[PDB]
Design a protein around this ligand. Structure first.
Ligand SMILES: [Mg+2]
Ligand SMILES: [Zn+2]
Ligand SMILES: [Zn+2]
Ligand SMILES: [Zn+2]
Lengths: 549, 84, 174, 105, 93, 268, 98, 64, 171
RNA sequence: GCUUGUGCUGUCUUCGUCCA
């Protein structure tokens, strides 16, 4: 209930369908066309329309609103633009796949070099998996080096000899055995030509190759129009109090747009083919290093400082990448960390929590008729006294900050509101020590609020945590809901974890001086007098009040 | 289609620990959001304790839908599952 | 708000000309196609309703709801006031007035005879239900008038349109 | 394979329950051939693209999934974790419905 | 809350706690998706109460999802590399 | 590798695709925290000791049940139906001994992790019902035979009436039924434990309930638990061994450091 | 401006030695000029021309100001250093070794 | 706004009698006063204070 | 034109209503939220057949919020105009720019550019009307018009008619 | 007659802490 109301029904994701983006789709989902390299209009605010920071792409500022959806910075997701390229270029990630498809089909009449008449081809057709189907078809048709004008009755073949295609850098060379020996010519296979050849491939041949007519079409691996990400993807940073530095992606897009304008102007005005080749290779290099700057066998694109450019690919890989670093694991709220100490006078499932940590952390409790008096007492106490509270949440979701409220003593609570009270005794919390090698490294304890700045543990739980009190630190996580509290108290609680499934034996025992003392005290020649016996019997919480003979 | 008739239910007749935890959490949340209680509470105030009391007396008005790997499901009432 | 029983309809690349709504071309769109599916997934035909059939159905449903809400114990105003919602009350009042001022058949037996004539006829076995509803609703008098008002009937020249119209006028209470 | 793993584990006196190593070698031999616990073994499966990319070779897996028009059915735990949804495990392996029949009492 | 802690919470079977940690205690975000193309290209003006996917040219088949902001960022970065991740709220078969 | 493996409501172990990894988790469908080391009493010893411990002859007077342990000691000799019941029990025990000694455990090891600690249940029954003193027992032999036989068909791991389900259910409880029959033998119950009727019914009910409580729960993420249970010892640790050998095994290396054969010769 | 206090600063924008300081309190007051907005529509003495760039004390620390240094840098602008002093008494959770 | 914020104050009653402080937060009677030597801030009712003026220490009522 | 359609609605119920009267309360909530509404995809929903015997099924508890979600399937009478369709109407207002008619709950606007020239608007007439030598169309007069265009709003439908063709105008 | 202001960089490098 932290989001403003929307009449769209709320559903969950059941399927993710992958595929390539078509140029028609890129143009259709775009809201503006990007054609001006200059970021700023006149260095007097109000960024230029049609530039890389167009206000229709979205708002990343507090006081400004998006001109496309009208929402604020918190709610606007950002909108895409497009950038028409003067000449088509290869997508750096699909170049070997383009090469294999070029091998699979005929460069003149866009048809597979073999038909279903060959039984091996029929068997290659039969496998449902597109990857394996493509692999089999490629393993067959790679050998075939000549289009067949007639059936091996005309299959539509043009009869031309299929060239040998070899990759060098991002440039494909097609060596034709032109008509024992002769002079063969190797001519550059420009992206436009391969795009035109792919465009004539029939849907059924496309299906035979493992591509899909609806989602993954072979000519969509050639970039003819580039989608422009919104500013939320590439935010600017404030280097100092005055100057603000642009993101790497914004600079790379500026380079791409300058190269595009260069190619267009060069083609329009006057065309020496060598200069066209140079500038178009520069454009191809910019588009390739915008997506992948770790290309083997060529120098990286560098910044003016000499550091390499941070490409989109490098944002998604590694420990600090998007997946590992922000989706499979992330930083979370409602957590605490401090040094741990031992406490012989704590229960096995209890944890001692400093008062400052209990004041900082909170749990949102719903106001009912069973707890309204206690909750309003907490609200009267305020955010600086324990037991107190920090916020009152209305049904509509408006928070009342009790720090800056001059009439907190005149706040009346209604049923259904939420009070973010301080951490209290017997609240279940999750406790954790890194590295978490097994599931007994995270267990649910009960809170006891105590003085001094350490966490306190019973000494029998130091074995599953593999912890000692010579400087170790441990983390604490506070559940924020009734269901989550029930899950912690009924599944992860310390007593339920005494016996481990790894070796069907307990993981917690009597240790250290309790073990030494229990050995010393149970020796045959240990005798105790009546007064000490009375003290030890009274020390037992479960003692029934009957002194043994 | 996907539903399985009550006579040919083959899943375990006992409440598992995950089902018990989820049912207690959901019932506690509902009680804390002003849902009618089906048991007589003497002096209990905590929603989780009231939910546990409801579970012990087989008075929780919830149904567990257990999913099979093929897609079919069986519907079990909280009052007809044995709880330890 | 309400969702139809027809789902899916995901993204593709081909575009068709049978997508725009058009009464003349008998292109009623996917949600009003000739073939429908019920809650059980069985085959179902599109159910058109003339003003007589619609008026009978709304009167029957409204009086059944009024009788049910009153513990099982005729005026249009009170019957409209039975429903809840001021905007709903206005909408049902407007529909009741429109149906009343253009009711071709106010009798159940006349409506039943009209429906049987327009359904069991051999010529009408090919007629679209929308065409049947339009013919029973508009109350046309001439074949040329019906063709001009309903362009779809121009291509179906194997229909005894004139005698069916005369039978409809005969069944119509003067 | 179980004998070798048991030898390695039990040499230094440690003990592990049989079912864990049984499950490990059953995963390693379920496909009819030996599947190594590597990217060459794990990521050559029919599992979802989002689940496979989160282990290793993220960008290559995503490019292959795009070019092959793969459909991820979102049944694994990793897909629901990275989509912020209730994973179909533990307390999320079932649904809870409201019992109208019992409420009449 | 790293990956090993995530595996420990999976081993405990506490799916609700894991979902709450990774969404409510972190980057919880709300997006709108077209019901046809499955893309995050809906232009929603919530106070004007008007939704539209201009590409698919539809105003009625639109849903809202609760996803991590990092997932939204990942999908937008994938879209920048010409990949189309389409999120659908129903299964097909 | 093991993250998406979960036990399902039909008892099978499957991955995210629904492919079956195990038709029953742990081949017994039990939880890893619910088993303890117990001895199977039919495996060790000699044939003379086994015969002395388990065989009850109602004809020979010096190889029968003692007369001070049963109140019906008079009208017991000479019966033939009861002798047939005792012979059926002994043949079942001999079949169990053959099975365990020849197929399952060939080196004679008999201390294995199993569920439901029977010794603890027996001594609990003795303490609760005060089974001390030389008082004769009112527990008839057919009651013992039928109680044990019925108990050995109520240990439900899988529910259903299909023949494959019954075959899998009988397979899953073979070792535990061998343990129960080895412990709850007629001569043992009458002489070593000295149970009465109430104690016997309590033991049977307790065995059934505790076996029901030891089954694995559907929804368990046993793959992650197995992964952690294998990786945890690896943290605390001429043939290559240890972590390099574990790496060789998990990577399925073609050229291992120390290849070797174990060649066994014929007896002579 | 920031949420901390500014009453402990002197006329020259610097705190004096011997003053108690808590977390977030401002110890160095600094401003940078900003081109004024359309506030020349009439704001007699309350039109903003500066942006605050002050230095607060660390939120987790508190102590006494011990010494304040004022000099000029290599280029020729002013340059300040403020030293804070506090006493740390041993307590539960402090690390010792032989 | 109270006229006692950011002003030197002295405590006249309770367990902190005769300690010099500075008023930091004042909402309803429970003035928050930081203590000059103990690095801490404590709540205190307005009745227990003494606000400094140009002519000795003045009580709370006699100053506002 | 009226039709019979099988419609579905998603109904969310707060836990405070989890009582024996849950089914009937859901029925009345469905009736209040469906009767009289106007959806552009379907048109106008006028009544729901068998309104007191609608199956509601079993509601699913939403994880993290407690509220139950119900899937209610029902059959209702729905009216929706189509492009190029001729229907009757009743004039509701007369203006120099054209006349506004009512077709049930739908209001149809016809501009003068879709009206024949001989039907000159007479503002001096009592009441004001678009009249010709042999035709006189005013407030409350029966008119037969052909729907040319339909404009869809969030929860409203705007239709545009024409009377310039044959067999149209006054009736 | 006089009313209290409402927040924060990025990228590398080095040195450390607790396990292993
Ligand atoms: Mg240590
Ligand atoms: Zn926007
Ligand atoms: Zn060819
Ligand atoms: Zn769309």
């Amino acid at each position: 209930s932290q989001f403003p109301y929307s009449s769209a029904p709320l559903r969950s994701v059941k399927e993710v369908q992958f595929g390539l983006l078509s140029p028609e789709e890129i143009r259709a989902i775009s809201v503006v066309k990007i054609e001006y390299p200059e970021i700023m209009d006149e260095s007097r605010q109000r960024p230029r329309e049609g530039g890389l920071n167009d206000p229709k792409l979205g708002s990343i500022d507090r006081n400004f609103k998006c001109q496309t959806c009208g929402e604020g910075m918190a709610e606007c997701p950002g909108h895409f633009g497009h950038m028409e390229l003067a000449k088509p270029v290869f997508h750096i990630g699909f170049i070997p796949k383009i090469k294999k498809v070029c091998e699979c089909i005929c460069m003149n009449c866009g048809k597979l070099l073999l038909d279903e008449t060959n039984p091996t081809m029929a068997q290659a057709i039969r496998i449902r998996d597109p990857k394996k189907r493509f692999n089999a078809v490629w393993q067959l048709c790679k050998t075939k080096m000549v289009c067949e004008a007639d059936a091996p009755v005309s299959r539509g073949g043009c009869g031309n000899t299929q060239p040998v295609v070899r990759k060098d850098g991002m440039k494909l060379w097609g060596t034709w055995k032109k008509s024992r020996d002769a002079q063969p010519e190797r001519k550059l296979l420009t992206p436009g030509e391969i795009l035109n050849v792919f465009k004539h491939i029939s849907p059924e041949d496309c299906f035979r190759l493992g591509f899909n007519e609806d989602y993954a079409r072979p000519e969509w691996m050639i970039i003819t129009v580039l989608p422009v990400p919104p500013p939320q993807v590439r935010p600017s940073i404030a280097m100092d109090e005055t100057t603000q530095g642009q993101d790497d992606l914004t600079h790379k897009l500026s380079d791409i747009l300058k190269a595009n304008i260069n190619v267009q102007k060069l083609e329009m005005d006057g065309s020496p083919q060598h200069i066209i080749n140079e500038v178009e290779q520069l454009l191809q290099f910019h588009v390739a290093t915008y997506m992948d700057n770790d290309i083997a066998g060529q120098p990286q694109a560098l910044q003016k400082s000499g550091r390499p450019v941070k490409a989109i690919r490098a944002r998604l890989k590694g420990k600090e990448g998007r997946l590992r670093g922000n989706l499979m694991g992330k930083r979370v709220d409602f957590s605490a960390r401090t040094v741990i100490s031992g406490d012989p006078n704590l229960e096995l499932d209890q944890v001692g929590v400093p008062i400052s940590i209990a004041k900082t952390l909170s749990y949102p409790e719903t106001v009912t008729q069973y707890n309204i008096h206690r909750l309003t007492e907490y609200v009267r106490n305020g955010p600086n006294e324990h037991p107190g509270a920090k916020y009152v949440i209305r049904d509509n979701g408006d928070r009342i900050d009790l720090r800056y409220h001059k009439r907190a003593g005149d706040i009346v609570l209604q049923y259904g509101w939420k009070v973010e009270r301080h951490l209290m005794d017997d609240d279940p919390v999750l406790f954790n020590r890194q590295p978490s090698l097994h599931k007994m490294s995270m267990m649910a304890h009960r809170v006891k609020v105590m003085p001094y700045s350490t966490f306190r543990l019973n000494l029998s739980v130091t074995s599953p945590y593999n912890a000692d009190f010579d400087g170790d630190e441990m983390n604490l996580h506070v559940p924020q809901s009734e269901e989550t509290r029930a899950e912690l108290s009924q599944l992860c609680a310390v007593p339920l974890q005494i016996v481990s499934p790894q070796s069907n034996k307990p993981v917690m025992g009597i240790v250290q001086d309790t073990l030494c003392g229990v050995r010393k005290m149970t020796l045959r020649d240990t005798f105790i007098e009546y007064e000490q016996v009375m003290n030890m019997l009274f020390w037992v919480p479960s003692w029934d009040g009957v002194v043994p003979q | 289609e996907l539903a399985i008739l009550k006579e040919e239910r083959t899943t375990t007749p006992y409440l598992t620990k995950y089902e018990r935890a989820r049912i207690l959490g959901t019932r506690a949340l509902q009680i804390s959001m002003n849902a009618p209680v089906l048991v007589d509470i003497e002096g209990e105030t905590d929603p989780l304790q009231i939910a546990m009391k409801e579970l012990s007396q087989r008075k929780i008005p919830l149904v567990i839908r257990r999913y099979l790997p093929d897609g079919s499901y069986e519907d079990w009432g909280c009052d007809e599952l044995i709880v330890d | 708000v309400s969702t139809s029983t027809v789902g899916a309809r995901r993204r593709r690349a081909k575009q068709q000309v049978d997508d725009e709504e058009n009464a003349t071309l008998l292109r009623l769109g996917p949600e009003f196609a000739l073939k429908q599916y019920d809650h059980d997934g069985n085959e179902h035909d599109l159910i058109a309703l003339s003003l007589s059939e619609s008026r009978l159905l709304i009167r029957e449903a409204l009086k059944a709801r009024s009788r049910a809400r009153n513990g099982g114990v005729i005026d249009d105003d009170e019957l409209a006031k039975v429903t809840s919602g001021a905007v709903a009350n206005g909408v049902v009042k407007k529909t009741l007035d429109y149906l009343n001022t253009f009711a071709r058949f106010k009798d159940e037996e006349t409506c039943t005879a009209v429906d049987q004539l327009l359904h069991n006829s051999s010529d009408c076995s090919v007629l679209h239900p929308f065409e049947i509803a339009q013919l029973s609703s508009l109350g046309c008098e001439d074949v040329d008038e019906a063709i001009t008002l309903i362009p779809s009937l121009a291509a179906k020249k194997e229909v005894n349109l004139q005698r069916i119209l005369d039978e409809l006028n005969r069944l119509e209470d003067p | 394979l179980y004998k070798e793993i048991l030898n390695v584990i039990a040499f230094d006196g440690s003990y592990v329950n049989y079912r864990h190593m049984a499950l490990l070698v059953d995963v390693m031999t379920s496909r009819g051939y030996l599947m190594a616990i590597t990217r060459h073994g794990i990521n050559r499966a029919d599992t979802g693209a989002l689940m496979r990319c989160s282990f290793e070779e993220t960008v290559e897996i995503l490019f292959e999934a795009g070019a092959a028009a793969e459909l991820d059915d979102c049944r694994g735990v990793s897909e629901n974790v990275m989509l912020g949804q209730l994973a179909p495990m533990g307390t999320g392996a079932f649904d809870v419905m409201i019992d109208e029949k019992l409420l009449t009492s | 809350f790293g990956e090993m802690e995530r595996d420990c919470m999976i081993a405990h079977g506490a799916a609700g706690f894991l979902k709450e940690r990774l969404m409510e205690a972190s980057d919880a975000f709300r997006v709108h998706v077209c019901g046809i193309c499955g893309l995050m290209s809906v232009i929603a003006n919530l106070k004007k109460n008007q939704f539209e996917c201009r590409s698919c040219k539809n105003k009625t088949n639109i849903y809202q999802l609760h996803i991590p902001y990092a997932a939204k960022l990942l999908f937008q970065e994938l879209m920048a590399m010409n990949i189309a991740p389409r999120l659908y709220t129903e299964r097909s078969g | 590798a093991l993250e998406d493996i979960m036990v399902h409501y039909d008892g099978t172990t499957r991955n995210s695709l629904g492919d079956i990894i195990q038709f029953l988790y742990g081949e017994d469908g039990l939880d890893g925290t619910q088993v303890e080391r117990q001895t199977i009493d039919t495996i060790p010893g000699s044939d003379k000791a086994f015969h002395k411990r388990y065989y009850v002859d109602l004809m020979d007077e010096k190889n029968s049940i003692k007369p001070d342990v049963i109140e019906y000691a008079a009208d017991i000799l000479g019966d033939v139906e009861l002798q047939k019941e005792l012979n059926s029990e002994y043949e079942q025990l001999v079949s169990d001994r053959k099975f365990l000694r020849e197929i399952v455990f060939v080196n004679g090891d008999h201390n294995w992790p199993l569920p439901v600690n029977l010794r603890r249940i027996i001594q609990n029954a003795q303490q609760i019902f005060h089974l001390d003193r030389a008082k004769a027992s009112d527990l008839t032999i057919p009651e013992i035979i039928h109680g044990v036989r019925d108990l050995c068909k109520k240990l439900f791991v899988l529910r259903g009436e299909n023949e494959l389900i019954k075959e899998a259910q009988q397979n899953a409880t073979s070792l535990f039924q061998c343990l129960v029959r080895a412990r709850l033998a007629t001569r043992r119950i009458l002489e070593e434990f000295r149970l009465n009727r109430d104690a016997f019914e309590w033991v049977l009910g307790t065995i059934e309930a505790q076996f029901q409580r030891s089954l694995v729960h559907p929804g368990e993420m046993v793959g992650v638990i197995a992964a952690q249970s294998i990786g945890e010892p690896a943290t605390q640790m001429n043939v290559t061994l240890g972590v390099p050998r574990l790496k060789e095994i998990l990577n399925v290396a073609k050229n291992i450091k120390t290849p070797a054969l174990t060649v066994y010769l014929d007896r002579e | 401006l920031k949420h901390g206090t500014y009453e402990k600063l002197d006329e020259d924008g610097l705190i004096a030695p011997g003053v108690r300081v808590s977390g977030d309190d401002i110890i160095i007051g600094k401003t940078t000029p900003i081109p004024p907005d359309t506030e020349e529509l009439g704001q007699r003495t309350k039109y903003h021309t500066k942006r605050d760039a002050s230095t607060p004390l660390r939120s987790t620390e508190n102590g006494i100001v011990d010494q304040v240094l004022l000099t000029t840098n290599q280029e020729g602008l002013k340059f300040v250093k403020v030293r804070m002093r506090t006493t740390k008494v041993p307590q539960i959770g402090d690390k010792f070794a032989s | 706004r109270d006229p006692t914020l950011n002003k030197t104050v002295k405590i006249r009653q309770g367990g902190y009698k005769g300690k010099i402080g500075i008023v930091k937060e004042a909402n309803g009677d429970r003035f928050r006063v930081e203590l000059h030597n103990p690095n801490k801030t404590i709540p205190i009712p307005c009745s227990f204070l003494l606000i400094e003026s140009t002519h000795g220490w003045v009580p709370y009522e006699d100053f506002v | 034109m009226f039709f019979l359609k099988d419609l579905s609605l998603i109904l969310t119920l707060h836990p405070s209503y989890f009582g024996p009267q849950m089914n009937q309360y859901l029925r009345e909530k469905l009736l209040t939220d469906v009767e009289g509404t106007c959806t552009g995809q379907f048109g106008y929903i006028v009544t729901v057949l068998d309104g007191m015997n609608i199956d509601v099924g079993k509601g699913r508890i939403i994880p993290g919020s407690g509220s139950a979600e119900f899937e209610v399937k029902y059959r209702a009478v729905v009216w929706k105009p189509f492009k190029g369709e001729v229907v009757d109407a009743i004039v509701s207002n007369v203006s120099p720019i054209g006349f506004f008619a009512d077709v049930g709950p739908l209001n149809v606007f016809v501009s003068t550019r879709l009206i024949p020239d001989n039907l000159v608007y007479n503002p001096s007439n009592s009441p004001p009307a678009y009249m010709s030598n042999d035709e006189l169309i005013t407030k409350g007069s029966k008119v037969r018009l052909k729907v040319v265009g339909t404009r869809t709003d969030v929860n409203e439908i705007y239709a545009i008619g024409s009377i310039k063709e044959d067999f149209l105008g006054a009736i």
